[PDB]
Amino acid sequence: KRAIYPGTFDPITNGHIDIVTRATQMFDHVILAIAASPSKKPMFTLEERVALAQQATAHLGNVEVVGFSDLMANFARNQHATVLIRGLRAVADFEYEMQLAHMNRHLMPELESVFLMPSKEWSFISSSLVKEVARHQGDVTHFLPENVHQALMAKLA
Amino acid sequence: KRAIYPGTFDPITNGHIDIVTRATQMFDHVILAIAASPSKKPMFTLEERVALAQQATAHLGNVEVVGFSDLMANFARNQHATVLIRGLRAVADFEYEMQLAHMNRHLMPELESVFLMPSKEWSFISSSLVKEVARHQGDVTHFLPENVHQALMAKLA
Amino acid sequence: KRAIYPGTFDPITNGHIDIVTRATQMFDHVILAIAASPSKKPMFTLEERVALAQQATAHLGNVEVVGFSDLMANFARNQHATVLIRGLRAVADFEYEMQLAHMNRHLMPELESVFLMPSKEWSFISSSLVKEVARHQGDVTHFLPENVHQALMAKLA
Amino acid sequence: KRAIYPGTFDPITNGHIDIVTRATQMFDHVILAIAASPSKKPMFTLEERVALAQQATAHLGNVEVVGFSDLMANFARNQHATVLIRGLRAVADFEYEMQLAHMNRHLMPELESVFLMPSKEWSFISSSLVKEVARHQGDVTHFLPENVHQALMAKLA
Amino acid sequence: KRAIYPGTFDPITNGHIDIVTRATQMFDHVILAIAASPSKKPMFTLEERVALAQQATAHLGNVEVVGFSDLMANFARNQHATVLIRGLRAVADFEYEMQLAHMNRHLMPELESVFLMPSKEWSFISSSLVKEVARHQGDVTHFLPENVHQALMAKLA
Amino acid sequence: KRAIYPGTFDPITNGHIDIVTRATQMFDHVILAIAASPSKKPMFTLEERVALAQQATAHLGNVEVVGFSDLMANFARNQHATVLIRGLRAVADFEYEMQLAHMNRHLMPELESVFLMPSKEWSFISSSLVKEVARHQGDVTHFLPENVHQALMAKLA
Numbered sequence: 056k057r058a059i060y061p062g063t064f065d066p067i068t069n070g071h072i073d074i075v076t077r078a079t080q081m082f083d084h085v086i087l088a089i090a091a092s093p094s095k096k097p098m099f100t101l102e103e104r105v106a107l108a109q110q111a112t113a114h115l116g117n118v119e120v121v122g123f124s125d126l127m128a129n130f131a132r133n134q135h136a137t138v139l140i141r142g143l144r145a146v147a148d149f150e151y152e153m154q155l156a157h158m159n160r161h162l163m164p165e166l167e168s169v170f171l172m173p174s175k176e177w178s179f180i181s182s183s184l185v186k187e188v189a190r191h192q193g194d195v196t197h198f199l200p201e202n203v204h205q206a207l208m209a210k211l212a
Numbered sequence: 213k214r215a216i217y218p219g220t221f222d223p224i225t226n227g228h229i230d231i232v233t234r235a236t237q238m239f240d241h242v243i244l245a246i247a248a249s250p251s252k253k254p255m256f257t258l259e260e261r262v263a264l265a266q267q268a269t270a271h272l273g274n275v276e277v278v279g280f281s282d283l284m285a286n287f288a289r290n291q292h293a294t295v296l297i298r299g300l301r302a303v304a305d306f307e308y309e310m311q312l313a314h315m316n317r318h319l320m321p322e323l324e325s326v327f328l329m330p331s332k333e334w335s336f337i338s339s340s341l342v343k344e345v346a347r348h349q350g351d352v353t354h355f356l357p358e359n360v361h362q363a364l365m366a367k368l369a
Numbered sequence: 370k371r372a373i374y375p376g377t378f379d380p381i382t383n384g385h386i387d388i389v390t391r392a393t394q395m396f397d398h399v400i401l402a403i404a405a406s407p408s409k410k411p412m413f414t415l416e417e418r419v420a421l422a423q424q425a426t427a428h429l430g431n432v433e434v435v436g437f438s439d440l441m442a443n444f445a446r447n448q449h450a451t452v453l454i455r456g457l458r459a460v461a462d463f464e465y466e467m468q469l470a471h472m473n474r475h476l477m478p479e480l481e482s483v484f485l486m487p488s489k490e491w492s493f494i495s496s497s498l499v500k501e502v503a504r505h506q507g508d509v510t511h512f513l514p515e516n517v518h519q520a521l522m523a524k525l526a
Numbered sequence: 527k528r529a530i531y532p533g534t535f536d537p538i539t540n541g542h543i544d545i546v547t548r549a550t551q552m553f554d555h556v557i558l559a560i561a562a563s564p565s566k567k568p569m570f571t572l573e574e575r576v577a578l579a580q581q582a583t584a585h586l587g588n589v590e591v592v593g594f595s596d597l598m599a600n601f602a603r604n605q606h607a608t609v610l611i612r613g614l615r616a617v618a619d620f621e622y623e624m625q626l627a628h629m630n631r632h633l634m635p636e637l638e639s640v641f642l643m644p645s646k647e648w649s650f651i652s653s654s655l656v657k658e659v660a661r662h663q664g665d666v667t668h669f670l671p672e673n674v675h676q677a678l679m680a681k682l683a
Numbered sequence: 684k685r686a687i688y689p690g691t692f693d694p695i696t697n698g699h700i701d702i703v704t705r706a707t708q709m710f711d712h713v714i715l716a717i718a719a720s721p722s723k724k725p726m727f728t729l730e731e732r733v734a735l736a737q738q739a740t741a742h743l744g745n746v747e748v749v750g751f752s753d754l755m756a757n758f759a760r761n762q763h764a765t766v767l768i769r770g771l772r773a774v775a776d777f778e779y780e781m782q783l784a785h786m787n788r789h790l791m792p793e794l795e796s797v798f799l800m801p802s803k804e805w806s807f808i809s810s811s812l813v814k815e816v817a818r819h820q821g822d823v824t825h826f827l828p829e830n831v832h833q834a835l836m837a838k839l840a
Numbered sequence: 841k842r843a844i845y846p847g848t849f850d851p852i853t854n855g856h857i858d859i860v861t862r863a864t865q866m867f868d869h870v871i872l873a874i875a876a877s878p879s880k881k882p883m884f885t886l887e888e889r890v891a892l893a894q895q896a897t898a899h900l901g902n903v904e905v906v907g908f909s910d911l912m913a914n915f916a917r918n919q920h921a922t923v924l925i926r927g928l929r930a931v932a933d934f935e936y937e938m939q940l941a942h943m944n945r946h947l948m949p950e951l952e953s954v955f956l957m958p959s960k961e962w963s964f965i966s967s968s969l970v971k972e973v974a975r976h977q978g979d980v981t982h983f984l985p986e987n988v989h990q991a992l993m994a995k996l997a
C-alpha cells in the first residue's frame with residue numbers, strides 16, 4: 056500500500072507532521088510529495104522545502120519526501136500510489152476539498168482520496184496564516200518544527 | 213489492518229455499499245458495525261439491519277457485519293480495529309463527523325478516523341431520505357440493494 | 370408555465386409570502402402546495418394550514434393553495450407543474466435543498482427546481498422560530514400575515 | 527454592564543465554563559440563565575440544572591445562576607442585562623445563532639448579542655455528545671465539572 | 684420573459700451548457716452574457732469565449748450569446764431582462780452567491796435572481812479547476828464541449 | 841475596558857459604522873485601527889482611509905481612529921486593548937474568522953475576540969464588493985457614509 060501526501064509545504068508545519076505521522080501508521084509507505092511549480096511564488100524554494108521536510112520527517116522511516124512538477128495525479132500514477140492523503144482541518148474549505156477529490160478521481164480512479172484529521176492543536180492553523188504572521192513580526196514558533204523555525208528566521212531576516 | 217465502518221445503516225443503502233467497497237480495497241479486513249441506536253427509533257430492528265447488511269455485502273469477502281450496543285470506541289478496541297471509516301458527502305456531514313471523530317480519539321487515541329468520499333451518484337442520498345420517499349410510495353429501487361428494497365417494500369404498506 | 374411551491378407552511382409566514390410573490394411575477398400560475406407532513410407533528414392541521422394560506426394569499430390572483438399527502442413528484446406531475454419553487458436563506462437551507470432537489474429530479478426529471486432568495490427582512494425567520502417565540506408570548510405580529518397571527522394567538526394560550 | 531449567558535445547559539460542561547469565564551473577564555456581572563426548554567425534554571430538571579451550574583461556578587464571584595421559562599428577551603430586560611452571550615464553535619453553530627440573535631434584537635434592540643469563542647480543548651463537545659457517550663458508559667470526566675460528572679453518573683445507570 | 688445568464692465562461696463548460704439548457708426550458712429567451720472585462724486576464728479572449736459559447740449553444744434556439752463590459756446589472760437593464768440565472772453547484776460558494784444576489788437586487792430590483800442546479804455530473808467542477816488541470820497536463824475532455832476541447836488544446840500547445 | 845476594532849476599512853462602510861457603534865455601547869473606549877500596510881494595494885491610501893473614518897465616526901465620542909503597521913496583535917498589546925472586535929456578517933467566512941481568532945489568541949491571550957452582528961441591512965455586503973461595483977459604474981451610495989460617497993466619486997473620476 057503506497058500512499059501519497061501532496062502539497063506545497065511552504066513551509067512544512069506541525070500540522071503537516073501530525074497528518075503524515077498518522078498516515079505512516081495506516082499505510083506501508085508514504086510519499087510526502089512537494090509541489091515543484093506553484094503559481095504563487097513560494098516563500099521557500101522547492102529545494103529548500105524538500106530539505107526542510109526531509110529533516111522534519113527524518114524520524115519517520117516509511118516516509119519519502121519527493122518533489123514533483125505538473126499534475127499531482129500524473130506523479131501519483133508514475134509512483135504507483137493508490138491512496139491520496141488529504142488533511143482536513145476544522146477550518147478547511149470543505150467544498151474545495153470535494154472539488155479536488157472528484158477531479159483527482161476523474162484523472163486517476165485507482166487513487167483513493169482519504170481524509171485524515173489533525174489534532175485539535177493544529178486544527179485551526181494554515182501555512183498561509185503562519186507565513187503572514189511571521190512576515191509581520193508575529194511569533195509562530197509553536198506551529199513549526201525547530202529546523203523550520205530556524206530556517207524561517209533566516210528567510211525573513 | 214482492521215477497519216471498522218460504524219453507522220446505524222437503517223437501512224444500508226447503495227451509498228454505504230459504495231463506501232465499504234472503497235474501504236475493502238484499502239484495508240485488509242473491514243467490519244461494518246451496526247449500532248443499536250435506540251434513541252433514533254430505527255425503522256428496522258438491529259437484527260433486521262444486520263441481516264440486510266450481511267446479504268447486501270455477501271459478495272465482499274473482506275467485509276464482516278456485526279451489531280453492537282456498546283460504546284463505539286470500546287467495540288472498536290475489542291474488535292481489534294485501528295481505523296474508523298466514515299463517509300463524507302456534504303458540509304453538514306463534516307462538523308458532526310469531527311465531533312464524533314475527536315470524541316472517539318479521546319476514548320481511543322490509536323483508533324484513526326478515516327473519511328472516504330462516495331461516488332457522485334450517491335452524494336445526495338441518505339437512509340432517511342430513502343425512507344421518506346418510500347413512505348410515500350416513491351420508487352427507490354435505484355438507491356438500495358435488491359434485498360434491502362424488498363425488505364423496505366415489505367416493511368411499509 | 371405552472372410552478373409549484375411545496376412546503377409544510379406550519380404556519381405560512383411573511384417569508385413564504387415573499388417567496389410566492391416573487392414566483393408569481395416570474396411564472397404564469399403558482400400552486401402553493403401544503404404537505405401533510407405528519408412525521409413533523411404540525412401545530413396546525415392540514416385543513417387549517419390550507420385555510421390560513423388561502424386567506425394570506427387572497428390578493429395574489431395567480432396563486433392556488435392546495436394540500437397533499439402524496440409523493441411530491443407525483444403531485445407535481447399530476448398538477449401539471451414543470452417548475453418547483455424553494456426559498457434559500459442560509460447555508461443549512463442549501464445542502465438539505467439539494468438532496469430533495471436531486472431526489473425530485475430522479476422521480477420527475479422534467480420538474481425543474483428553482484431557488485429564490487427572500488428579502489433581507491425575512492432572511493432569518495422560520496415557522497419554527499415564530500412558533501417558539503409565540504409559545505413564550507413574544508410579539509410575532511411583524512413576521513406573520515394578519516389572519517395567521519390571530520390564528521396562532523388563538524391556537525396558543 | 528450586565529451580561530446574560532442563556533442556554534439549556536443540560537448539563538453545563540467545561541465548554542460552558544470556558545465561555546462564562548471569558549465573559550466575566552469582560553463584563554462586570556454575568557447572569558448564567560438556564561431555560562426550562564421543555565420541548566427539548568432535558569435530562570436534568572431545571573432545578574437540577576440550576577444546582578449543578580451554581581456549584582460549577584461557585585468560584586466565579588461575578589456569575590449569578592438563575593432559571594427561567596419566560597421569553598428570553600423579556601427575561602433579559604427584566605434582569606437589566608444589555609449584553610447577550612453565546613459561544614461559537616462551528617459553522618452549524620452560526621446560522622442558528624444569527625436567527626436567535628436577530629429575533630432577540632427584534633424583541634429587545636438594546637440587547638446586544640456578543641459571541642465568544644471557546645478554547646480549542648472544548649471546540650468539539652456539546653451537552654448532547656457528552657450525554658450520548660455517558661449513556662454508553664464512556665469516560666467523560668474530562669469534559670465536565672466534578673459535581674456535574676457525579677450527577678451525570680448518578681443520573682444514569 | 685427575458686432571462687440573462689452572465690459569467691466569464693472562460694471557457695464554457697458542460698456545466699454551463701447544462702444550466703443554460705435548463706433555463707431555456709423555463710424562459711422564452713435566454714441571454715448568455717459573457718463578461719468582457721474581467722480583472723483576471725482570461726485564458727481565452729472575449730471574442731474567443733463568445734465564439735466558443737455560440738458554437739456550443741448553436742442547437743439552443745432561444746439562446747443568445749452576447750458580450751458585455753462594465754456592470755452586469757446595467758447590461759441586464761438595457762437588455763430588458765427580468766430574470767437573472769445563477770448556477771448553484773454542490774461545491775458553490777453559497778455565501779458569495781448571497782452577496783452577489785443581494786447586491787444585484789439593490790442595483791436592479793426588477794431583476795429576479797433564480798438559482799438552478801446542474802446535474803450531479805457537473806456539480807463538483809469549476810472552470811477554474813478545469814483550466815488549472817488542463818494547464819498542468821491533465822485530461823479535462825469530459826467536462827467540455829468538443830469545440831471547446833479542440834480550442835483548449837490549441838491554446839495550451 | 842479598551843477594545844480594538846481592526847481592519848483595512850478601504851473604504852469605511854455603513855456596516856463598519858454599525859459595528860463600531862454597537863461596540864461603543866458596550867466598551868468604554870474603542871480604537872478603530874486601520875491597517876497601514878496591506879498586501880493588496882488599497883483603493884484609498886492609509887491617510888485617506890483614516891481621514892474618512894475619522895469624519896464618519898466624528899459623532900462617536902469614545903471612538904479613536906488610529907492607523908497601524910505590522911502585526912495587529914502587537915499594536916493591540918501596545919495600545920493595551922483587551923477586547924478584539926470582529927464583525928460577523930451573514931455572508932462572513934466563518935472558518936477564516938476562526939483561524940484569525942485562534943491565531944490572535946496564540947499571539948496575545950489577554951486579547952479576547954468578541955464577534956458582533958450588524959443589522960440585517962448590512963449583513964450581506966462587503967467593502968470588496970462595494971468597490972468592485974462602484975468601479976464598474978454601479979450605485980453604492982446606500983452602503984457608504986456621505987463623506988465616503990463623495991470621496992469615492994472623486995477617486996473613480
Ligand SMILES: CC(C)(COP(=O)(O)O)[C@@H](O)C(=O)NCCC(=O)NCCS
Nearest residue numbers: 218219220247283284312315316659662
Ligand atoms: C452510529 C454512530 C457511528 C453514528 O452513525 P450514523 O450517523 O450513521 O447514525 C454513532 O452514533 C455511535 O458511535 N454510536 C454508538 C454509541 C457511542 O459510542 N456514541 C458516541 C460516539 S462519539
Ligand SMILES: CC(C)(COP(=O)(O)O)[C@@H](O)C(=O)NCCC(=O)NCCS
Nearest residue numbers: 345348375376377404440441469472473
Ligand atoms: C414538504 C417538503 C417540500 C419539505 O418542505 P419543508 O422544509 O417546508 O418542511 C418535503 O418534505 C416533501 O416533498 N414532502 C412530501 C413527501 C415527499 O415526496 N417527500 C420526498 C421529498 S424528496
Ligand SMILES: CC(C)(COP(=O)(O)O)[C@@H](O)C(=O)NCCC(=O)NCCS
Nearest residue numbers: 502505532533534561597598626629630
Ligand atoms: C435556551 C436558548 C438560549 C437556546 O440555547 P441552547 O442552544 O443552549 O438550547 C433559546 O432556546 C431561548 O432563548 N429559549 C427561551 C425561549 C425563547 O425566548 N425563545 C426564542 C429565542 S429567539
